[PDB]
Amino acid sequence: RPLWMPGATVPAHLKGELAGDFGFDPLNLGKDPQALRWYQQAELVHGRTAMTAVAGILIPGLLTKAGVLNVPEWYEAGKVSAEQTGIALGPLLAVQLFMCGFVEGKRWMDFLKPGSQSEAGSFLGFEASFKGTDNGYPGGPFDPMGMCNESEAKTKDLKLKEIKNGRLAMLACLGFAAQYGATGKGPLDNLADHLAAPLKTTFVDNGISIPIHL
Amino acid sequence: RPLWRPGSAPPAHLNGELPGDFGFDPLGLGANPESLKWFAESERVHARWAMLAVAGILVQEVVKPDVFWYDAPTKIDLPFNIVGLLAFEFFAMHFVELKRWQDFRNPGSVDADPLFPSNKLAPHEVGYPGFAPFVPGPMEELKVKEIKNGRLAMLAFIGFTMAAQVTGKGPLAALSEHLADPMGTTIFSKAVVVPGQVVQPECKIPQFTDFQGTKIFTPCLFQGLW
Amino acid sequence: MKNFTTYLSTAPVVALAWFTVTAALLIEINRFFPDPLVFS
Amino acid sequence: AYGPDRPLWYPGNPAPAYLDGTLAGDYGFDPLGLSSDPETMRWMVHAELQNARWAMLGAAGVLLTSIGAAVGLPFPEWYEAGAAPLPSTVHGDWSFGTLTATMFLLFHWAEQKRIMDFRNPGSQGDGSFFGITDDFKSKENGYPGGRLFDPIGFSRGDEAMYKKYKQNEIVNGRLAMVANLGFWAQYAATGKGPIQNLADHLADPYHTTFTTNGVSVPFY
Amino acid sequence: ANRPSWFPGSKFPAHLDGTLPGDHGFDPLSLGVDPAKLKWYQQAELQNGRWAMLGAAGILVPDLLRAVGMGGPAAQVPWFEAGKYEYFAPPSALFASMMFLFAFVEFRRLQDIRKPGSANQDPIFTNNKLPAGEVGYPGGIFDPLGYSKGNMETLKLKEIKNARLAMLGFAGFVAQYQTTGKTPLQNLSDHLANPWSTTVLSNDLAR
Amino acid sequence: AGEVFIPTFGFLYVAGWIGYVGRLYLNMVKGEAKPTEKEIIIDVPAALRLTWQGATWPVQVVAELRANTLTEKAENITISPR
Numbered sequence: 010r011p012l013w014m015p016g017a018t019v020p021a022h023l024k025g026e027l028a029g030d031f032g033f034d035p036l037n038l039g040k041d042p043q044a045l046r047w048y049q050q051a052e053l054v055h056g057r058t059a060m061t062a063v064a065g066i067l068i069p070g071l072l073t074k075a076g077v078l079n080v081p082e083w084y085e086a087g088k089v090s091a092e093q094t095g096i097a098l099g100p101l102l103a104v105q106l107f108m109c110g111f112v113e114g115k116r117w118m119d120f121l122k123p124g125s126q127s128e129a130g131s132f133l134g135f136e137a138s139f140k141g142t143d144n145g146y147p148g149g150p151f152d153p154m155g156m157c158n159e160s161e162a163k164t165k166d167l168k169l170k171e172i173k174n175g176r177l178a179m180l181a182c183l184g185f186a187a188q189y190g191a192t193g194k195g196p197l198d199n200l201a202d203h204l205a206a207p208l209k210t211t212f213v214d215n216g217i218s219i220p221i222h223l
Numbered sequence: 224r225p226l227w228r229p230g231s232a233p234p235a236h237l238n239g240e241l242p243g244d245f246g247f248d249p250l251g252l253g254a255n256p257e258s259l260k261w262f263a264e265s266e267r268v269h270a271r272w273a274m275l276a277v278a279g280i281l282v283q284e285v286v287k288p289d290v291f292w293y294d295a296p297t298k299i300d301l302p303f304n305i306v307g308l309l310a311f312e313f314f315a316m317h318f319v320e321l322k323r324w325q326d327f328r329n330p331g332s333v334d335a336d337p338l339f340p341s342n343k344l345a346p347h348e349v350g351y352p353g354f355a356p357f358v359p360g361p362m363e364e365l366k367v368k369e370i371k372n373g374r375l376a377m378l379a380f381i382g383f384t385m386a387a388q389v390t391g392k393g394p395l396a397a398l399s400e401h402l403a404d405p406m407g408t409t410i411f412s413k414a415v416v417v418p419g420q421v422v423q424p425e426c427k428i429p430q431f432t433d434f435q436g437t438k439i440f441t442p443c444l445f446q447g448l449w
Numbered sequence: 450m451k452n453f454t455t456y457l458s459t460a461p462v463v464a465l466a467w468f469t470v471t472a473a474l475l476i477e478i479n480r481f482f483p484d485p486l487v488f489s
Numbered sequence: 490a491y492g493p494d495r496p497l498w499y500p501g502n503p504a505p506a507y508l509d510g511t512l513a514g515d516y517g518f519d520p521l522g523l524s525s526d527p528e529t530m531r532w533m534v535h536a537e538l539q540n541a542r543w544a545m546l547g548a549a550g551v552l553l554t555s556i557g558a559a560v561g562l563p564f565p566e567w568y569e570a571g572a573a574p575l576p577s578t579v580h581g582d583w584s585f586g587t588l589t590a591t592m593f594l595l596f597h598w599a600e601q602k603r604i605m606d607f608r609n610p611g612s613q614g615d616g617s618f619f620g621i622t623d624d625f626k627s628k629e630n631g632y633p634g635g636r637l638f639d640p641i642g643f644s645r646g647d648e649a650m651y652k653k654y655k656q657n658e659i660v661n662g663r664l665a666m667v668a669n670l671g672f673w674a675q676y677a678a679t680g681k682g683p684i685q686n687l688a689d690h691l692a693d694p695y696h697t698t699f700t701t702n703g704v705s706v707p708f709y
Numbered sequence: 710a711n712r713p714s715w716f717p718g719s720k721f722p723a724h725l726d727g728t729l730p731g732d733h734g735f736d737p738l739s740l741g742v743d744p745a746k747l748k749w750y751q752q753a754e755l756q757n758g759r760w761a762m763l764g765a766a767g768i769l770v771p772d773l774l775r776a777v778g779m780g781g782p783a784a785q786v787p788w789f790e791a792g793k794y795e796y797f798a799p800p801s802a803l804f805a806s807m808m809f810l811f812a813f814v815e816f817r818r819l820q821d822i823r824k825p826g827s828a829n830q831d832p833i834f835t836n837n838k839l840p841a842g843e844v845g846y847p848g849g850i851f852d853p854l855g856y857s858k859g860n861m862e863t864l865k866l867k868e869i870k871n872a873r874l875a876m877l878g879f880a881g882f883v884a885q886y887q888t889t890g891k892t893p894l895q896n897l898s899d900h901l902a903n904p905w906s907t908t909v910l911s912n913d914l915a916r
Numbered sequence: 917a918g919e920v921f922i923p924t925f926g927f928l929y930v931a932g933w934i935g936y937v938g939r940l941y942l943n944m945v946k947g948e949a950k951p952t953e954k955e956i957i958i959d960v961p962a963a964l965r966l967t968w969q970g971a972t973w974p975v976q977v978v979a980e981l982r983a984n985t986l987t988e989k990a991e992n993i994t995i996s997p998r
């Protein structure tokens with residue numbers, strides 16, 4: 010089985026089953042089966058959220074830097090949209106919290122009790138759809154085009170593609186924040202500046218990554 | 224079996240089957256059988272390339288004694304642009320080298336005309352494609368002549384290059400300079416390293432030789448260790 | 450060496466090492482970043 | 490070496506039990522029982538097969554650049570060959586910070602694979618890196634034979650030549666390590682760099698010793 | 710003793726046995742090792758190829774007519790400029806209309822990749838229907854000249870080869886225009902003038 | 917915030933890190949042969965394999981509260997006569 014590091018000792022609770030099980034639990038965090046299950050759902054949610062966010066920071070930018078759109082920088086769009094829409098931060102956030110809270114509540118209870126949201130009579134007409142299939146995979150209303158119903162090996166491929174792309178997107182978001190935090194420019198700007206003089210424009214030569222006093 | 228040093232004992236790996244075996248592996252390089260098989264292909268390829276080269280350097284000095292073989296490229300007018308000549312040369316050599324290597328990898332696989340399957344080279348030994356329209360004498364005898372001639376040529380080339388770095392002329396001009404003052408043109412007569420002194424021959428090759436407006440770095444082989 | 454390393458593992462020796470490293474770290478930190486009153 | 494009656498370090502004194510004589514360049518020399526532990530021996534053997542190999546390359550450089558600078562060839566002496574301007578690159582210009590980071594980055598990858606195989610033999614030979622397997626295996630601790638590390642096949646060939654070659658490596662490596670301390674200590678006393686120190690000692694051999702250099706012997 | 714090899718003297722990939730048309734044993738990155746994927750990837754070669762054969766004949770032709778002068782001002786427009794060229798409706802309307810049109814043909818064709826032999830039937834006219842055919846080779850009305858009897862096998866090994874060449878052709882046109890910034894025929898003429906100095910290397914070196 | 921506030925969490929994180937790593941080691945040597953001789957002659961190897969495990973101590977500590985494993989049952993702790 011592919012491992013995060015060749016020769017690394019596979020833990021024990023990480024038996025090839027979860028999508029992306031490369032045997033990486035150095036600090037034995039997922040030792041508890043319940044903890045591992047919650048962490049698995051947490052990972053999927055983190056990856057999916059990051060993938061749908063880095064796509065909203067890179068894609069819109071690459072097209073702005075190609076003249077197609079005019080979207081502002083991810084670290085400036087917030088203010089631009091606030092002054093554009095006119096909605097006050099407070100009201101905008103509060104509404105979002107309530108809507109996100111309700112959807113999170115349903116998913117949360119579905120974990121606490123698997124396939125429980127499909128209670129007879131709960132969500133008017135739809136409870137059935139709110140059943141769920143496996144931990145972080147609410148098949149049905151989600152995955153409408155039925156791509157995870159083709160075979161039992163297209164599921165295991167499409168699921169390794171979600172996790173590897175997610176893990177990458179999650180690290181990409183951390184990078185974008187750190188890049189702007191140190192460089193003070195957009196991600197594309199950083200990449201372009203690096204490709205210009207690759208051997209003279211790195212995190213070392215930024216002034217913030219390593220405060221070299223000596 | 225003639226040995227490189229009469230009275231020596233040939234290393235076990237050299238039982239002697241390869242043409243031109245003289246039990247010469249002082250450092251035991253071809254100890255690995257597969258390694259020896261590769262080195263064998265390298266020896267033949269090096270010799271054949273060197274044999275053509277040495278001959279060309281000598282001829283290009285009888286016909287056109289002016290252009291120096293070392294700087295010939297910068298002293299000759301290519302009918303085609305170097306970029307174009309290099310491009311064609313790369314693809315041409317790449318094709319022959321690939322088929323040539325594939326035979327060494329899997330013997331008897333590329334022994335056929337890919338464009339015309341009707342044409343097919345007869346079964347042959349690796350290192351010997353099969354192009355033998357004329358073989359003047361026993362194949363093994365001619366094989367020994369090819370390796371002995373090739374080994375001599377390879378040594379001659381290094382001599383051509385080093386002589387071209389110590390002196391600033393080609394093989395014929397250098398030999399004449401020797402024939403003129405035999406006891407005062409030898410390397411000993413032009414370079415001596417004493418326990419305290421270090422006389423090294425001057426490098427007659429400019430560190431960088433400009434070519435068509437592009438200065439080409441031309442270093443004197445280990446000019447520091449002469 | 451198995452028994453020398455055992456001695457270098459005894460509580461008094463390990464504590465002497467751990468503390469020396471921790472102390473030196475704080476000393477070196479103030480040496481390059483002096484007067485750290487606030488996290489700014 | 491490579492014998493029960495192998496020549497020893499202090500003729501007479503018996504050799505240590507852990508030092509049987511198999512290990513390359515074994516002369517039974519461990520006065521402070523540093524390698525009393527068998528696992529310690531393996532680690533110490535690997536470490537020596539690491540310091541000596543780097544030391545050998547380093548000595549080859551301090552001698553080649555030095556020989557050049559003495560003959561005249563523009564070559565900065567080992568001590569001043571760091572302040573020398575970094576050369577440009579097709580990609581761009583080199584920066585000291587990037588250079589150090591790149592040097593450590595690449596080293597971390599190789600060191601990890603080497604140590605991981607050292608801790609778990611054959612771990613690297615799992616076709617994980619582009620299918621390379623046996624080439625990523627280790628013939629012996631400190632001997633990573635293969636078709637990528639021993640291309641010519643000295644290890645794959647006559648074992649006697651391999652064993653002899655192993656002794657050459659250990660003895661030459663130990664000499665290079667000692668030589669390197671010289672290059673550094675002669676510099677931090679003479680301030681001239683080797684091949685100039687060999688040249689001064691061959692011009693006035695009797696009045697150009699360590700005793701007459703100011704730093705070595707303080708009173709003299 | 711088997712099919713032609715992309716590189717004579719090399720072994721055939723295990724998954725590539727020769728069943729597929731044009732199976733010259735070429736999958737170095739092992740992209741189509743998965744048989745299920747080999748099936749999708751195969752159909753994608755056909756569709757991507759057939760569309761590129763039309764794309765290459767849709768660029769070389771207009772330029773050929775323009776060069777001869779036979780082509781009208783429309784042909785005088787370079788393919789990489791036809792987008793700006795006016796016609797009757799704005800670029801948006803044309804794209805939207807072609808989308809709706811494509812949705813029907815594409816979905817109807819997919820019904821055949823998903824359930825092979827389940828789309829061959831005129832919806833409006835029950836009487837009209839295509840005969841049984843390999844997924845990817847519709848036949849029937851899609852073969853009006855009835856060439857589906859005369860050596861289908863070698864006419865199919867003629868399509869894949871032409872398709873692969875046409876696909877590399879459309880790559881060359883874009884790449885040459887990406888660097889040279891000229892029409893394909895212009896680049897070809899630039900070569901046939903000084904061919905030993907207008908090579909990509911010389912051009913990129915000059916850049 | 918840089919004064920007292922932010923510094924507060926910083927100490928709490930390291931404090932819990934030190935405490936969590938300590939309990940991890942204690943509960944590993946418990947059981948192991950003579951647990952009393954691994955407190956005087958500390959097992960520096962295993963002590964060095966548990967130090968980094970306390971980096972994500974908050975995540976592991978909570979997972980233990982929400983699993984009833986951080987504390988001991990009241991009927992297994994000796995208590996002084998009332």
Ligand code: CLA
Nearest residue numbers: 934935936937938939940941942958959962963964966967
């Ligand atoms: C794993 C080591 C460890 C841990 C996790 C704890 C944890 C705790 N101690 Mg405690 N303690 C320890 C060691 C430890 N102690 C030692 C060695 C001593 C002797 C000096 C004491 C003496 C002590 C007293 C007198 C009291 C506590 C109290 C407490 C509780 C209050 C929380 C607090 O602020 O800590 C408090 C910690 C201290 C006051 C001193 C200990 C601080 C040391 C430096 C930490 C131990 C590090 C350890 C050596 C690491 C081992 C690593 C291993 C690999 C070798 C708490 C649960 C209080 C309590 O009972 O609450 C009700 C209290 O009254 N401790």
Ligand SMILES: CC1=C[C@H](O)CC(C)(C)[C@H]1/C=C/C(C)=C/C=C/C(C)=C/C=C/C=C(C)/C=C/C=C(C)/C=C/C1=C(C)C[C@H](O)CC1(C)C
Nearest residue numbers: 060063064152153154156174177178181184185188196199
């Ligand atoms: C469910 C459903 C239903 C049915 O079934 C169908 C359908 C519809 C299809 C489905 C859907 C799905 C989805 C949504 C998906 C998504 C995806 C994504 C977005 C990904 C991303 C993904 C993403 C990612 C990876 C990311 C990446 C990024 C990166 C690398 C970055 C990098 C960088 C950094 C850091 C910084 C600098 O300065 C710059 C750079 C250099 C640039």
Ligand SMILES: CC1=C[C@H](O)CC(C)(C)[C@H]1/C=C/C(C)=C/C=C/C(C)=C/C=C/C=C(C)/C=C/C=C(C)/C=C/C1=C(C)C[C@H](O)CC1(C)C
Nearest residue numbers: 736737738739740760761764767768788791876877879880
């Ligand atoms: C097989 C293999 C295997 C191994 O493993 C790996 C590897 C090697 C990678 C692989 C390979 C692959 C490849 C090569 C692929 C390719 C593809 C292509 C190129 C396609 C085309 C494709 C192409 C195409 C479609 C084309 C298209 C086009 C079109 C529609 C149109 C256009 C135009 C024209 C007419 C003219 C006008 O005025 C304008 C327009 C309108 C604009």
Ligand SMILES: CCCCCCCCCCCCC/C=C/[C@H](O)[C@H](N)CO
Nearest residue numbers: 615616617618619620621622737738739
């Ligand atoms: C464009 C990048 C192409 C990289 C070159 C080919 C991909 C290399 C992937 C390495 C994966 C292991 C190498 C091969 C392993 C064997 O075929 C089996 N799959 C593993 O035993």
